[PDB]
Amino acid sequence: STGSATTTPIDSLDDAYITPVQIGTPAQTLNLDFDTGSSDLWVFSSETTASEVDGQTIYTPSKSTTAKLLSGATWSISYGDGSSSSGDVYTDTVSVGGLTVTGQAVESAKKVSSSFTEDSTIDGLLGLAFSTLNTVSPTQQKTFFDNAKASLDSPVFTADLGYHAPGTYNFGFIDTTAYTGSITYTAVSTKQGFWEWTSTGYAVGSGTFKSTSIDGIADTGTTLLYLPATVVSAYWAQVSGAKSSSSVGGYVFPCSATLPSFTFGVGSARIVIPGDYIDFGPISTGSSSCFGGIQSSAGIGINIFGDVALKAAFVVFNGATTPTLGFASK
Ligand SMILES: NCc1cccc(NC(=O)c2ccc(F)cc2)c1
């Protein structure tokens, strides 16, 4: 089998991407944030504290003839960005772009943190990291990809995120029309439960490439590119007036600037992030200070190849016995 679904930016900045997911019988379609950095499929629901729902579409298990309470199971997740959610668990039929999994754990939120409530466009998350990170207790549950894997034509999914435009998540096949050149594959460590890999270096604009190993995760659920402070300083030093602002929470730059590109290495290959992808717009409405899309990972504890980086590539998440990642230009 295969599946193919379009993923759409939630706003004009590409702050996140939403993909429609069918849950239950008859189907209830929720728009979920596909997150290769976590491993829980959780949804706003009829059980979510009413004061914490503000415009989201909810899953109502009582209206699904295939929903079954997973008795005794609870979940609770705290994401690296400070957001969190928790609740109980149903199993139900879940379909993405025509690919169906029966008996998928659908984690129903009873509580969500304010950042989820405030984002009316995101009805939940669909985790695509390794199932070892799934938070369901006392019986850990599998991700949608892990449940589908054996049925897929090939044990892979691909992320093709757009810049200020829709893109695609494919399951079970590699669309050879979706990228240019060849796909360069690179090794993955699953020891922390992430799609963790090592970039071979970087360049800033037209500058020379610096060969240096940068360990980090391929995370479709993180908006920006978080890299070591040395790398980030070298980037922003090429932008007149850019500075790190403790009051804003990262690097800002004059909105009048034209940003340089940023290149990262995948083996001997190179992915180029155009400068425009690094502009996240005014820090507050009407400001002439703009927020940078490349930020320091100092204090996060891990480097994160988030959407800013991934949207510059066609990315293969290869879930073969030994997982690997593939990157192609597009
Ligand atoms: N998408 C799941 C996932 C996995 C690992 C790390 C994070 N994110 C962070 O740690 C983070 C912290 C501070 C920031 F400003 C931005 C991101 C998220």
Beta pairing class for 196-204 and 262-266: antiparallel
**Structural domains in the chain (count):** 2
**Distance (Å, rounded) from C-alpha 136 to C-alpha 125?**
14
Question: Is-contact 129 143, C-beta < 8 A?
Answer: yes
Same domain membership, residue 59 and residue 184: no
Q: Cα–chain-centroid distance for residue 225?
A: 11
The letter for the amino acid at 187 is A
In terms of domains, do 211 and 187 share one? yes
Residues 6 or more apart in contact with residue 320 via CB below 8 angstroms = 155, 156
Burial class of residue 230 (count of CB atoms within 10 Å of its CB; 0-12, 13-18, 19+): exposed
Shortest-distance Cα residue to atom 12 of ligand 1 = 81
Q: Are residues 26 and 101 in the same domain?
A: yes
Site to substitute for ligand 1 among 41, 190, 300, 307, most atoms within 8 A of C-beta: 300
Same domain membership, residue 126 and residue 49:
yes
Last residue of a domain, one of 116, 144, 174: 174
Distance, in Å, from the CA atom of 152 to the CA atom of 170, rounded to the nearest integer, reads: 11
Same domain, 241 and 290: yes
Single-letter amino acid code for the residue at 27: A
Residue among 239, 245, 315 nearest 275 (CA): 239
Looking at 174, 209, 239, the residue that finishes a domain is 174
List, by residue number, the catalytic residues. Answer: 35, 199
Structure tokens at 146: 């892990």
Mutate to test the pocket of ligand 1, among 115, 135, 246, 304 (most ligand atoms within 8 A of CB): 304
Amino acid sitting at position 298: A
The answer to whether residues 193 and 99 belong to one domain is no
Nearest CA-CA partner of 39 in 141, 170, 157, 169: 141
Nearest Cα residue to 293 out of 303, 311, 282, 308 = 308
- Contacts with 309 (C-beta within 8 Å, 6 or more apart), sequence order: 225, 264, 271, 273
Contact (CB, 8 A) for 78 and 125: no
Residues 48 and 163 placed together within one structural domain of the fold: yes
Q: What is the DSSP letter of 15?
A: -
**Dihedral sign computed on CA atoms, order 209, 232, 291, 265:** positive
How many angstroms is it from 109 CA to the middle of ligand 1? Answer: 20
Select from 308, 327, 314 the least CA-distant residue to 268: 327
DSSP-derived letter for residue 50 is G
Write the residue with the smallest CA distance to atom 17 of ligand 1: 81
Residue nearest to atom 14 of ligand 1 (CA): 81
Same domain, 264 and 330: yes
Residue where a domain terminates, one of 125, 143, 174: 174
Q: Which H/E stretch holds residue 317? A: strand 314-318
Pocket (CB within 6 angstroms of ligand 1) = 35, 37-38, 79-81, 219, 221-222, 300, 304
Asked if 29 contacts 124 with a C-beta cutoff of 8 angstroms, the reply is no
Cβ–Cβ < 8 Å for 311, 179: no
Tell whether 284 and 258 lie within a shared domain. Answer: yes
Beta bridge partners of 34: 126
Q: Are residues 125 and 190 in the same domain?
A: no
Which tokens go with 232?
Answer: 């980030």
- Residue whose CB lies within 8 A of the most ligand 1 atoms, among 34, 39, 79, for a mutation test: 79
Give the residue whose CA is nearest to atom 15 of ligand 1: 81
Tokens for 74, please give them: 């609870």
Cα distance between residue 281 and residue 266, in whole Å: 28
Q: Residue 221: CB partners within 8 Å, gap ≥ 6?
A: 16, 33, 34, 35, 36, 37, 38, 125, 306
For atom 16 of ligand 1, the residue with the nearest CA is 81
How many CA atoms, within 13 angstroms, populate the side-chain half-sphere of residue 22? 16
Domain limits for position 124: 5-174
Closest by Cα among 38, 144, 123 to 81 = 38
Burial class (CB in 10 A: 0-12, 13-18, 19+), 126: buried
Q: Which helix (H) or strand (E) holds 251?
A: strand 250-254
Distances (CA, A) of 3 to 33, 116, 174, 297, 313: 17, 27, 11, 34, 20
Q: What are the structure tokens assigned to 207, written together?
A: 């500058």
Experimental method: X-ray
CATH code of the domain containing 64: 2.40.70.10
Using the structure block, give the residue that is written with the tokens 């969190």. 84
Structure tokens of 290? 């703009």
316 Cβ contact list (under 8 Å, min separation 6): 156, 158, 174, 183, 185, 324, 325, 326, 327, 328
Ligand 1 nearest atom to the CA of residue 306, by list position = 1
Within 10 A of 21 (CB to CB), how many other CB atoms are there? Answer: 26
Contacts of 61 (CB under 8 A, 6+ apart): 24, 45, 46, 67, 69, 90, 92, 106, 108
Q: Which of 318, 315, 309 is nearest to 277 (CA)?
A: 309
Strand 250-254 to 289-292 pairing: antiparallel
- One-letter amino acid at 264 equals F
| Ligand 1 geometric centre to CA of 137 (Å) | 23
CA of 141 to the centre of ligand 1 (A): 22
Same domain, 181 and 330: yes
Give per-residue burial for 43-64: e unless 16+ CB within 10 Å, then b.
Answer: bbbebbeeebbeebbbbebeeb
Asked whether residue 200 falls in the same domain as residue 121, the answer is no
Strand ranges for 54-98 from DSSP E = 68-78, 84-96
**Cα(215) to centroid(ligand 1), Å:** 15
User: Which helix (DSSP H) or strand (DSSP E) does residue 185 occupy?
Assistant: strand 184-187
Amino acid (one-letter) located at 171:
F
* Those residues with Cβ within 8 angstroms of residue 310's Cβ, 6 or more apart along the chain or in another chain: 159, 161, 218, 219, 220
Q: What angle do CA 327, 18, 24 make, to 5 degrees?
A: 115
Nearest to 243 by CA among 209, 292, 308, 194: 292
CB neighbour class for 139 (10 Å; exposed up to 12, middle 13-18, buried from 19): exposed
How far, in Å, is the centroid of ligand 1 from the Cα of 66?
A: 34
* Tokens 């928790």, located at residue: 86
Tokens linked to 259: 């940003």
- Residue 101 gets the label, from left (phi > 0), alpha (psi -120 to 50) or beta, of beta
**Residue positions counted in the chain:** 330
Q: Count the neighbouring beta carbons within 10 Å of the beta carbon of residue 182.
A: 10
Residue 232: closest CA among 268, 257, 262, 255: 262
Q: Return the closest-CA partner of residue 15 out of 315, 328, 311.
A: 311
What would the two tokens of residue 323 be? 């997982």
